[PDB]
mmCIF file with all atom_site columns, C-alpha atoms in Angstrom:
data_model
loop_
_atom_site.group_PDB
_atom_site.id
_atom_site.type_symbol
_atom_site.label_atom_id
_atom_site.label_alt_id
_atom_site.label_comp_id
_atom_site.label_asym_id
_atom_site.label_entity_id
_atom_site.label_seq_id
_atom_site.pdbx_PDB_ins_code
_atom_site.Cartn_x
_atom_site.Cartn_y
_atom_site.Cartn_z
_atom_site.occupancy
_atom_site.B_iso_or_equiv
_atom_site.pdbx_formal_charge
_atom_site.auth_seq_id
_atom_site.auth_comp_id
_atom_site.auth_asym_id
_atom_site.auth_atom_id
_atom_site.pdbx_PDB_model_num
ATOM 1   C CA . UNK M 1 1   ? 4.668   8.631  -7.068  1.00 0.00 ? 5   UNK M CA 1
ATOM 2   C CA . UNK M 1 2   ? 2.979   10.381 -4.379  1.00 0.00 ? 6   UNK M CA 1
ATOM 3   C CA . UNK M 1 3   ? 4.368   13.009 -1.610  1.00 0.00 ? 7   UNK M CA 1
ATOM 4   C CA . UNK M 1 4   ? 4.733   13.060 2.290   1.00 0.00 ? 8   UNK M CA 1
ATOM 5   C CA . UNK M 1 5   ? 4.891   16.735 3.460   1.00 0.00 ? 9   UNK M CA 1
ATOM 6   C CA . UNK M 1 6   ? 5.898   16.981 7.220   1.00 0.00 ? 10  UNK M CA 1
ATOM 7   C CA . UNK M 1 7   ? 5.770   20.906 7.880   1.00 0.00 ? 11  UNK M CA 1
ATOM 8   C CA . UNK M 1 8   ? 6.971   21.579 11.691  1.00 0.00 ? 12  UNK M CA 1
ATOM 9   C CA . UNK M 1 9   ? 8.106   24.107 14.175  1.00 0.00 ? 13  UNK M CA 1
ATOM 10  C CA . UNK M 1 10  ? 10.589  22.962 16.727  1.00 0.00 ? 14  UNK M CA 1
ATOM 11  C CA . UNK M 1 11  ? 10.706  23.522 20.577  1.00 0.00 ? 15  UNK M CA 1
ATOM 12  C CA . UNK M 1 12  ? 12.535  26.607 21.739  1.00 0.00 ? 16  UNK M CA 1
ATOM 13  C CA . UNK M 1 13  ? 15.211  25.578 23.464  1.00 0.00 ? 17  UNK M CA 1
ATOM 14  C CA . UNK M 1 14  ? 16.121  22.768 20.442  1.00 0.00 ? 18  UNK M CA 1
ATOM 15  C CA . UNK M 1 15  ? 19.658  24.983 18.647  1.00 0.00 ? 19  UNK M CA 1
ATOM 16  C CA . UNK M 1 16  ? 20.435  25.567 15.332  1.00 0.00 ? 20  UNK M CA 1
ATOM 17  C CA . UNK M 1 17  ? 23.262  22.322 15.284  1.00 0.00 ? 21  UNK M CA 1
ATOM 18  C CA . UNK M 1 18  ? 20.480  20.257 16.767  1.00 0.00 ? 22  UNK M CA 1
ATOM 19  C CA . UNK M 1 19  ? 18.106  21.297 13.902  1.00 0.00 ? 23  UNK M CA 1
ATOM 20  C CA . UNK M 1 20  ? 21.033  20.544 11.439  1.00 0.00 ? 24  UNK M CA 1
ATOM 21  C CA . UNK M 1 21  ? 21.810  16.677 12.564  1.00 0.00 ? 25  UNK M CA 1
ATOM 22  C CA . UNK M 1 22  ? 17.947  16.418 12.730  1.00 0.00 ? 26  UNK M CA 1
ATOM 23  C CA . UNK M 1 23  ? 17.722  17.174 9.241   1.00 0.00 ? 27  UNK M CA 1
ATOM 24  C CA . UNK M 1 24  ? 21.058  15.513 7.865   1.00 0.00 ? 28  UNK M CA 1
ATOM 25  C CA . UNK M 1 25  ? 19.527  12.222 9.970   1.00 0.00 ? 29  UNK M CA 1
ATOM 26  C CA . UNK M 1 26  ? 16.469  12.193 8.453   1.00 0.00 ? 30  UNK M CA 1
ATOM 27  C CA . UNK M 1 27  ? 17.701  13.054 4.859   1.00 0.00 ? 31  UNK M CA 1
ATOM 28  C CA . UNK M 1 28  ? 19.834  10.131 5.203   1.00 0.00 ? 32  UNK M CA 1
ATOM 29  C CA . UNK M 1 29  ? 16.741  7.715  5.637   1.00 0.00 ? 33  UNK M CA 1
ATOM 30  C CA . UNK M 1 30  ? 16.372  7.518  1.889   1.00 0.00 ? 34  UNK M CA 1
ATOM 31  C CA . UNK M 1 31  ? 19.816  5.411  2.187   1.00 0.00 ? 35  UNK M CA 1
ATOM 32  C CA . UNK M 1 32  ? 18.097  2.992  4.555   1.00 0.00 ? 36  UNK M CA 1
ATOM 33  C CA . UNK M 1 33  ? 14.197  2.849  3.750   1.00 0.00 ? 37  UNK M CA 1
ATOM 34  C CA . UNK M 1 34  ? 13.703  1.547  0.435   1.00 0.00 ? 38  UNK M CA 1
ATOM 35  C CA . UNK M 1 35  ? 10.331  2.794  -0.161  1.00 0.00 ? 39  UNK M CA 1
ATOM 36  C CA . UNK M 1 36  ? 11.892  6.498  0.550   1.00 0.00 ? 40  UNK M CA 1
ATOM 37  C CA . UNK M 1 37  ? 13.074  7.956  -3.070  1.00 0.00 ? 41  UNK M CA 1
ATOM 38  C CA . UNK M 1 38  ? 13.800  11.395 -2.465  1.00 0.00 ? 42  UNK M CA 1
ATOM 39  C CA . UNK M 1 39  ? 13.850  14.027 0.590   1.00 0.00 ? 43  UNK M CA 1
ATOM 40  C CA . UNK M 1 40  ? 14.059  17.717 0.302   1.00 0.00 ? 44  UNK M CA 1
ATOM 41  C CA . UNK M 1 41  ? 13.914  20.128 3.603   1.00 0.00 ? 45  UNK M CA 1
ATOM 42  C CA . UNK M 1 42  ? 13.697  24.021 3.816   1.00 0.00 ? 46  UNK M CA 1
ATOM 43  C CA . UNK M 1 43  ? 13.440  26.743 6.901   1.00 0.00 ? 47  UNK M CA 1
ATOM 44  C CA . UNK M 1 44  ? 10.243  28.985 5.685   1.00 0.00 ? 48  UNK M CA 1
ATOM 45  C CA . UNK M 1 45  ? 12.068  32.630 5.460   1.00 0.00 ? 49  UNK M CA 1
ATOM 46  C CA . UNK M 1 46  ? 8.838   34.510 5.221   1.00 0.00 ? 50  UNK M CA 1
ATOM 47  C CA . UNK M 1 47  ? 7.462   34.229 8.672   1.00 0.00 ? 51  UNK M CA 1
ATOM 48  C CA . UNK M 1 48  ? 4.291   35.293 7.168   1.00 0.00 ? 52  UNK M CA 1
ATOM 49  C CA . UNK M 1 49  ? 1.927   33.302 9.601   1.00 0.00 ? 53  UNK M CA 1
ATOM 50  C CA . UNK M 1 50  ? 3.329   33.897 12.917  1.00 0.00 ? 54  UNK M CA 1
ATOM 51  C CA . UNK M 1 51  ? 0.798   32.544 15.531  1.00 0.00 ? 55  UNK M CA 1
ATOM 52  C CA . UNK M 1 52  ? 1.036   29.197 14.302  1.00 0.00 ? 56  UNK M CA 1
ATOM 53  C CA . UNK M 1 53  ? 4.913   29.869 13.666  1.00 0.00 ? 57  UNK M CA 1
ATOM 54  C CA . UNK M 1 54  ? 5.675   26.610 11.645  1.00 0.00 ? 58  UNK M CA 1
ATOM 55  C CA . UNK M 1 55  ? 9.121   27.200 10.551  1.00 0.00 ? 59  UNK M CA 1
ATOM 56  C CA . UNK M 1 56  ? 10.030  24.044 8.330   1.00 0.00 ? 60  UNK M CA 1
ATOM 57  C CA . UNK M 1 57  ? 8.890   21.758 5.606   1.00 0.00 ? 61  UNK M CA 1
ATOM 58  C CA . UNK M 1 58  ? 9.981   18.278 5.036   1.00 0.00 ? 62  UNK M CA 1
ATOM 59  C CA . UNK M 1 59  ? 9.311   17.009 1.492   1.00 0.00 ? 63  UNK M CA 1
ATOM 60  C CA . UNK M 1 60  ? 9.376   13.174 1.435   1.00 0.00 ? 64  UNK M CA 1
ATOM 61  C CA . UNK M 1 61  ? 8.109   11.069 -2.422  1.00 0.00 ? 65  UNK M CA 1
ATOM 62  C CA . UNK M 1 62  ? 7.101   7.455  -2.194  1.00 0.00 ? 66  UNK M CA 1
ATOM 63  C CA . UNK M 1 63  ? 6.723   5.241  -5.386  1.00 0.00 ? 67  UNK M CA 1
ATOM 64  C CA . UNK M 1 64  ? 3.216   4.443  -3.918  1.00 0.00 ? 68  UNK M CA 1
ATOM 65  C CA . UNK M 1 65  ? 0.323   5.020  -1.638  1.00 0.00 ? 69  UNK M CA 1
ATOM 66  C CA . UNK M 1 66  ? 0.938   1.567  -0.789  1.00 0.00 ? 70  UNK M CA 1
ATOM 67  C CA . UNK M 1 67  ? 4.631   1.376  -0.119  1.00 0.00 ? 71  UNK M CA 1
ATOM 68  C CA . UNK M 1 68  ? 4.393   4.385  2.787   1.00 0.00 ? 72  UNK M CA 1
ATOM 69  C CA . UNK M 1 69  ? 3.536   1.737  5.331   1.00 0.00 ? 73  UNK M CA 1
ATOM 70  C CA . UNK M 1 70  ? 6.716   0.297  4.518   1.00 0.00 ? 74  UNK M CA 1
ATOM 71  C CA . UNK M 1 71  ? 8.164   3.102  5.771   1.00 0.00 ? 75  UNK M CA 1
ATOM 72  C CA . UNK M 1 72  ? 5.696   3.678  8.636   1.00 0.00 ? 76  UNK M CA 1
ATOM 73  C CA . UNK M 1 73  ? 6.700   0.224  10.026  1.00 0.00 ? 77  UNK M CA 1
ATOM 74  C CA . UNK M 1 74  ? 10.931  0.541  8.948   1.00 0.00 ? 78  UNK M CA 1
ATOM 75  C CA . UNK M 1 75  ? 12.747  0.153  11.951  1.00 0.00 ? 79  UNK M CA 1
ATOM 76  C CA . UNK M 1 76  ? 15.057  2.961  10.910  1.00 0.00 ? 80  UNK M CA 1
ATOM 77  C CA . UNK M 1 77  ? 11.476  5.434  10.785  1.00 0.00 ? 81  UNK M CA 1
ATOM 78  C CA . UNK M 1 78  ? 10.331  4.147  14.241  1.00 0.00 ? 82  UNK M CA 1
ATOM 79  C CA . UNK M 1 79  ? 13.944  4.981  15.325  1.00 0.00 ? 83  UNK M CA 1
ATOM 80  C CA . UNK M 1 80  ? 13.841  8.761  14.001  1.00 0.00 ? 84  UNK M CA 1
ATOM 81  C CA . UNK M 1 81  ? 10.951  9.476  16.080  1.00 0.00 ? 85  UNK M CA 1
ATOM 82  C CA . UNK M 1 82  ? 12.707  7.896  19.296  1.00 0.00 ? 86  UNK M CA 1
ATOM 83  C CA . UNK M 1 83  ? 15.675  9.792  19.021  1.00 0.00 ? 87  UNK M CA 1
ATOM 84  C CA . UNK M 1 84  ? 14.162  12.976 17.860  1.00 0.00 ? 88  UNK M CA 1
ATOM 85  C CA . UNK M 1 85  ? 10.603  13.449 19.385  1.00 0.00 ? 89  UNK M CA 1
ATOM 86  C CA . UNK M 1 86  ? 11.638  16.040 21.790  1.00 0.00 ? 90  UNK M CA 1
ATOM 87  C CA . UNK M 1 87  ? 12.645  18.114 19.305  1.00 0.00 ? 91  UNK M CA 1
ATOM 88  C CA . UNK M 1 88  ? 9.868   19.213 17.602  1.00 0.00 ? 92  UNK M CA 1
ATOM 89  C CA . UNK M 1 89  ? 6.683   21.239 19.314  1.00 0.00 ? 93  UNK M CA 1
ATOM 90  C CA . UNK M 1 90  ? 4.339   20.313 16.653  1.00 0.00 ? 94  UNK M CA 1
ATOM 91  C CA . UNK M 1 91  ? 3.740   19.450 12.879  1.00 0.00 ? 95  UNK M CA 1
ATOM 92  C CA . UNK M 1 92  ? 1.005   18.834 10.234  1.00 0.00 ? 96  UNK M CA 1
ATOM 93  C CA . UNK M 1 93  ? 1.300   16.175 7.949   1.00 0.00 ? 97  UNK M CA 1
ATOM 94  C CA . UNK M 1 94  ? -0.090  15.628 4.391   1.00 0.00 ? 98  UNK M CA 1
ATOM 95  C CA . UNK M 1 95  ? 0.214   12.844 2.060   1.00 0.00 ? 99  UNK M CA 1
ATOM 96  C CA . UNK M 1 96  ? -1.140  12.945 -1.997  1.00 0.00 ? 100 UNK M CA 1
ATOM 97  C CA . UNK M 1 97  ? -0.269  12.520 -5.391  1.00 0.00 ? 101 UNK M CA 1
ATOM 98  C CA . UNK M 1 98  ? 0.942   15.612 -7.466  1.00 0.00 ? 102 UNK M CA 1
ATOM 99  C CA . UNK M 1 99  ? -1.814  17.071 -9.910  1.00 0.00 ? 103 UNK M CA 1
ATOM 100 C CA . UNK M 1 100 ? -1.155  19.377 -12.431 1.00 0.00 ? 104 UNK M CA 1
ATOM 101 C CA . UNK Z 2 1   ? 15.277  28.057 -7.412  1.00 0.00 ? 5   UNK Z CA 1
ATOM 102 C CA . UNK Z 2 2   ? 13.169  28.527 -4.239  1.00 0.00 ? 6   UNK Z CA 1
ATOM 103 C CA . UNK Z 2 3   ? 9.701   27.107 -3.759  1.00 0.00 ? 7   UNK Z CA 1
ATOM 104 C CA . UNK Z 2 4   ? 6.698   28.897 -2.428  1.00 0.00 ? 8   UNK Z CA 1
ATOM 105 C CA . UNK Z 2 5   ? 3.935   26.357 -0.535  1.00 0.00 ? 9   UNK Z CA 1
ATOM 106 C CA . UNK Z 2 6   ? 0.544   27.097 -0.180  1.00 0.00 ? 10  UNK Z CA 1
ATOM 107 C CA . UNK Z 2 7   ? -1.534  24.926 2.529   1.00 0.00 ? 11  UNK Z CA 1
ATOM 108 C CA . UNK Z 2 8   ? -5.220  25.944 2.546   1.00 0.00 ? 12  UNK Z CA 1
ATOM 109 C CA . UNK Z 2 9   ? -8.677  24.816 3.430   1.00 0.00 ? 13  UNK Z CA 1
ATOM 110 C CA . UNK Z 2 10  ? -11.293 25.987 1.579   1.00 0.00 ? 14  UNK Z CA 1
ATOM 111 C CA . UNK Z 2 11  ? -14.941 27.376 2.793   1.00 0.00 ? 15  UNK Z CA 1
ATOM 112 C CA . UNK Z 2 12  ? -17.565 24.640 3.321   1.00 0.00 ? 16  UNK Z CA 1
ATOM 113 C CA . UNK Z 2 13  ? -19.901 26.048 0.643   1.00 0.00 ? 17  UNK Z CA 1
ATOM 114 C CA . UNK Z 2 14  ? -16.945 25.835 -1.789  1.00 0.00 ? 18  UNK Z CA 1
ATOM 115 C CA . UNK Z 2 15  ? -18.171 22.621 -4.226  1.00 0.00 ? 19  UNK Z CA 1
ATOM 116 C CA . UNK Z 2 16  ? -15.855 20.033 -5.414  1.00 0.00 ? 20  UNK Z CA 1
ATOM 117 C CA . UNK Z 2 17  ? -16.205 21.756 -9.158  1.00 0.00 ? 21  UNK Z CA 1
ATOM 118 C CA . UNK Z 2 18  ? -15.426 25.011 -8.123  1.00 0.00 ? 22  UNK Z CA 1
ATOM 119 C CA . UNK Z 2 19  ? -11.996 23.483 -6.444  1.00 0.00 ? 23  UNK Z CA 1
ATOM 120 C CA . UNK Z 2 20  ? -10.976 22.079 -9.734  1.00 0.00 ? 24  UNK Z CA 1
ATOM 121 C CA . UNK Z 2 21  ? -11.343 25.548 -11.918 1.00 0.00 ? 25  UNK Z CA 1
ATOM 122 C CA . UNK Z 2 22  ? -10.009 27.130 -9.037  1.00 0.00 ? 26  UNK Z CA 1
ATOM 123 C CA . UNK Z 2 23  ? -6.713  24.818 -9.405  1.00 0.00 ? 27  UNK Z CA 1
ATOM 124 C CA . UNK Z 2 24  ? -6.556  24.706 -13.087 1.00 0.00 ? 28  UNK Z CA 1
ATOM 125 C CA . UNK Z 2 25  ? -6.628  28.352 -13.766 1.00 0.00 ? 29  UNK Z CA 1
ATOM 126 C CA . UNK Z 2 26  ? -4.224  28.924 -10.612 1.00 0.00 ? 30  UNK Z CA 1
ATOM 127 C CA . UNK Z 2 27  ? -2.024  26.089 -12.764 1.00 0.00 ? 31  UNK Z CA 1
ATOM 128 C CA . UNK Z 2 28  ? -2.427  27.880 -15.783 1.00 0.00 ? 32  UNK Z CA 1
ATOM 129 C CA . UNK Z 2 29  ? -0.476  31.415 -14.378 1.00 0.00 ? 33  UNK Z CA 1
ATOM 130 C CA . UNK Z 2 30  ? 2.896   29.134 -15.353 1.00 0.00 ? 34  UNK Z CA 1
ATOM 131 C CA . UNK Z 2 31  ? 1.581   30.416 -19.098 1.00 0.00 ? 35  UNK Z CA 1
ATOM 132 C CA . UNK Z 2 32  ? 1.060   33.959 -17.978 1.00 0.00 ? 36  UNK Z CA 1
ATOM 133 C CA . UNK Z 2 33  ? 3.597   35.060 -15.110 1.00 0.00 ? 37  UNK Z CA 1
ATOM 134 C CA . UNK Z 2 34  ? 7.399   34.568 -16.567 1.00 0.00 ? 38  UNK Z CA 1
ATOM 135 C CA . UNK Z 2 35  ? 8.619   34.437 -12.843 1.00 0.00 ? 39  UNK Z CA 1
ATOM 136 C CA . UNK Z 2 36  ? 6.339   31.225 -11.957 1.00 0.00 ? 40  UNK Z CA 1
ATOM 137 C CA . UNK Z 2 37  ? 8.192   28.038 -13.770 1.00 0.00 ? 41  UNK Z CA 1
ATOM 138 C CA . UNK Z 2 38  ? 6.097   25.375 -12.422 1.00 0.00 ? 42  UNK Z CA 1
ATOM 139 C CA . UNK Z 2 39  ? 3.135   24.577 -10.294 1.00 0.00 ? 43  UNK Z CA 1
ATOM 140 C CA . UNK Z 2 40  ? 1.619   21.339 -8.931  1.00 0.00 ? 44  UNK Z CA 1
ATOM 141 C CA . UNK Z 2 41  ? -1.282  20.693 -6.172  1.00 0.00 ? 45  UNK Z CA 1
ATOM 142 C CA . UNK Z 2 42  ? -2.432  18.473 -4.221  1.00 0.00 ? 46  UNK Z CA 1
ATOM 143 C CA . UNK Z 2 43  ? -5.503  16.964 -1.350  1.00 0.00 ? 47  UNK Z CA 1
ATOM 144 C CA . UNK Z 2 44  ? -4.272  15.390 1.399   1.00 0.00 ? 48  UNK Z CA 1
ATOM 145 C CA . UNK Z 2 45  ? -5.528  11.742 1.810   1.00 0.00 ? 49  UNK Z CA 1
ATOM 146 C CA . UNK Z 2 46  ? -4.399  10.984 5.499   1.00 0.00 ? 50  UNK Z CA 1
ATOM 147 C CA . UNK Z 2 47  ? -6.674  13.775 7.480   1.00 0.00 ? 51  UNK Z CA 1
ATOM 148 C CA . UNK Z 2 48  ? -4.681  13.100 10.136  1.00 0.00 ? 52  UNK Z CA 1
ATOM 149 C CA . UNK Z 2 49  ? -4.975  16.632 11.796  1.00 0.00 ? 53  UNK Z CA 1
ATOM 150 C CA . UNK Z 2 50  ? -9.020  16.908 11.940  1.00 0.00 ? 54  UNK Z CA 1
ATOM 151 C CA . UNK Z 2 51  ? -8.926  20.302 14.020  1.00 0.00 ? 55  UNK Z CA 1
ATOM 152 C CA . UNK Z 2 52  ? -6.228  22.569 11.596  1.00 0.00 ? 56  UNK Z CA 1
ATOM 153 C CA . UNK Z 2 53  ? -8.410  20.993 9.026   1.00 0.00 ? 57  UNK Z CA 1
ATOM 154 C CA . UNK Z 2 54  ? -6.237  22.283 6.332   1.00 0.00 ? 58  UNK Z CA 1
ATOM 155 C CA . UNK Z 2 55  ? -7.071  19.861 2.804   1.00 0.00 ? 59  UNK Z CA 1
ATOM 156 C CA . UNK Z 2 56  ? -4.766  21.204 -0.202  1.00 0.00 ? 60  UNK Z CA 1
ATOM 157 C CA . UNK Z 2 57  ? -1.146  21.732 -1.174  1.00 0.00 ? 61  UNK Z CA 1
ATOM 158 C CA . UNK Z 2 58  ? 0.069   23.781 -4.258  1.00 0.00 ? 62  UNK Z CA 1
ATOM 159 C CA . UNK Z 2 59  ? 3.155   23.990 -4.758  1.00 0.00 ? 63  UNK Z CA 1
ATOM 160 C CA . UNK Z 2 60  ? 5.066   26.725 -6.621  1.00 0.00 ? 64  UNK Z CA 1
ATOM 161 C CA . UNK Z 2 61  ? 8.791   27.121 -7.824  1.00 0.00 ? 65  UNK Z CA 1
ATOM 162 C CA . UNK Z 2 62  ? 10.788  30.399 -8.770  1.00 0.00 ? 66  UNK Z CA 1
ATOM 163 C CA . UNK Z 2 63  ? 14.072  30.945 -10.199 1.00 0.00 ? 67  UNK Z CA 1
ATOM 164 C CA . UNK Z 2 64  ? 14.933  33.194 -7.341  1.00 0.00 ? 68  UNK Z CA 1
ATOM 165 C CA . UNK Z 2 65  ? 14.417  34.704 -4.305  1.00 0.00 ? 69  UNK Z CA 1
ATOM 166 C CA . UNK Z 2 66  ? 14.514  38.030 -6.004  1.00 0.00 ? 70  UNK Z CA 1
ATOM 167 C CA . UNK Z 2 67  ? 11.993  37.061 -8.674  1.00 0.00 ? 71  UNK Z CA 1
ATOM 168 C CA . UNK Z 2 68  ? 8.817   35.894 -5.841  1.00 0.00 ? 72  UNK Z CA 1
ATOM 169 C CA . UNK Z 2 69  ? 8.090   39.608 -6.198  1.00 0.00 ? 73  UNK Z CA 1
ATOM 170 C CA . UNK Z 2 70  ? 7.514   39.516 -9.706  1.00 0.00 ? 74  UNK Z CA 1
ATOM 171 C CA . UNK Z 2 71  ? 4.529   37.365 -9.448  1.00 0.00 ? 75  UNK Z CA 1
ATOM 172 C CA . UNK Z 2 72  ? 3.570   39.005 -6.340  1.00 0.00 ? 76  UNK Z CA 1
ATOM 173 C CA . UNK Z 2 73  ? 2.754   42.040 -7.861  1.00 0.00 ? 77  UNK Z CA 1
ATOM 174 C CA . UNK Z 2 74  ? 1.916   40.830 -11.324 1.00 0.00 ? 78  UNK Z CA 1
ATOM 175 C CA . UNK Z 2 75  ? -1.941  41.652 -12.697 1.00 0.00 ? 79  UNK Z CA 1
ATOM 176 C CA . UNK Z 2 76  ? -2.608  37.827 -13.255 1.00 0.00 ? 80  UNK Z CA 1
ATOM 177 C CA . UNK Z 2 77  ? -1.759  36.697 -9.633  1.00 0.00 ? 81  UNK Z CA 1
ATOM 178 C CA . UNK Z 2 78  ? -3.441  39.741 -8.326  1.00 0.00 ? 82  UNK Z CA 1
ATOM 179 C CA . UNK Z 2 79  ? -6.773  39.344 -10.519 1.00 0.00 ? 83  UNK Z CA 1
ATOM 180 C CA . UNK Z 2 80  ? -6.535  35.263 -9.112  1.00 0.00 ? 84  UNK Z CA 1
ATOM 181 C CA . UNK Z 2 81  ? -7.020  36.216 -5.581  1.00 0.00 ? 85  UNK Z CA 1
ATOM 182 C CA . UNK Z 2 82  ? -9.483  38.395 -6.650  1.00 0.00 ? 86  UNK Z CA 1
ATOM 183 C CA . UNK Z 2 83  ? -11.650 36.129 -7.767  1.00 0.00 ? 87  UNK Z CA 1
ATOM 184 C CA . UNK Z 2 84  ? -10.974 33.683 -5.878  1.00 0.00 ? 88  UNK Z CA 1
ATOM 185 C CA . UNK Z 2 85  ? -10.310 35.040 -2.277  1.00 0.00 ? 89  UNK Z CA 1
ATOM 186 C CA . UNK Z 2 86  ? -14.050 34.038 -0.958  1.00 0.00 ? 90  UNK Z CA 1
ATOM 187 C CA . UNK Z 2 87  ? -12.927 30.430 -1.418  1.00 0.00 ? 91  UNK Z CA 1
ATOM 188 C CA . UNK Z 2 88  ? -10.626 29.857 1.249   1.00 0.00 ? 92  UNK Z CA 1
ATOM 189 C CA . UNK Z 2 89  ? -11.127 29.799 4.666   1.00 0.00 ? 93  UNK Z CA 1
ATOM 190 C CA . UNK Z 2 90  ? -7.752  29.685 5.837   1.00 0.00 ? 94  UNK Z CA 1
ATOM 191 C CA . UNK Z 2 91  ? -4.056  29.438 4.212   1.00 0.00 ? 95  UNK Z CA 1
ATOM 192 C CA . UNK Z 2 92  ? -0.406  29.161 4.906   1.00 0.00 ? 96  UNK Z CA 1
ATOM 193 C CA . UNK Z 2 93  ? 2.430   30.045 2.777   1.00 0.00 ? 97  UNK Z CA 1
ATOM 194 C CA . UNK Z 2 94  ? 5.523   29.267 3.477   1.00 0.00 ? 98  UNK Z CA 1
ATOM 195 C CA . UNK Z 2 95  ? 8.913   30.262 1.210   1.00 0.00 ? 99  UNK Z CA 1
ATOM 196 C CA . UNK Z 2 96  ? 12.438  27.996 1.036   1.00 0.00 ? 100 UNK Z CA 1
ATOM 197 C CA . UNK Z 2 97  ? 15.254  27.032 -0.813  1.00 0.00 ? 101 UNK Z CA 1
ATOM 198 C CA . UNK Z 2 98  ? 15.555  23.734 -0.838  1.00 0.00 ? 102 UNK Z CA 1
ATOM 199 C CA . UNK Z 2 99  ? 17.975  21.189 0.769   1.00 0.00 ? 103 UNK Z CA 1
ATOM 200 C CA . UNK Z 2 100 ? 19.205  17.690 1.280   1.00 0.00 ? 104 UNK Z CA 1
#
């Protein structure tokens, strides 16, 4: 299993509802994307890095490295980022498998 | 249970061997700090945001809020950044409960 990390700060005029359907959307992807097992989210509450002011992290895991493009190309993925790219003012993205 | 995400990039000098002992002894404060109940880390594969540059994940979960301050202040998490602070060039931490 490997992990998708999406960690983003939204645009300042996007409201707290609008942050909440974005979230409950994409949550509900897992429902819809096969390759998607499991989603967590979470608002950052430290604020400790405040010039770059990302505010949220996405957790996505994947059975594979090679099933992701399954969910890069999903119909329902392509139609997140339609509906939602004006929400968000930037992100970071990571992908890799869990060491320990 | 809240989880406390590091995102870091380490110095150029830093050597692929010094990364690994500087993950498996950060691993290794589960044993020592009661607060910290699991650990896992990670490189990003994708690079896909060259300039921010940032390479690693670790990924820390506490039993509460309440308890983060625990290991904050604890002599083993302390003594870790103290030996290892001239590894990193940059880092951010970010604290959440998570949700789905």
């Amino acid at each position: 299993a490997v992990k998708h990390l999406i960690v983003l700060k939204f645009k300042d005029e996007i409201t707290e509802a609008q942050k909440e359907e974005f979230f409950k959307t994409y949550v509900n992807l897992v429902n819809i994307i096969p390759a998607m097992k499991d989603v967590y989210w979470g608002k950052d509450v430290t604020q400790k890095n405040k010039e770059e002011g990302y505010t949220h992290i996405v957790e996505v895991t994947f059975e594979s490295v090679e099933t992701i493009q399954d969910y890069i190309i999903h119909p329902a993925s392509v139609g997140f980022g339609d509906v939602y790219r004006s929400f968000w003012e930037k992100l970071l993205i990571f992908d890799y498998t869990p060491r320990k």
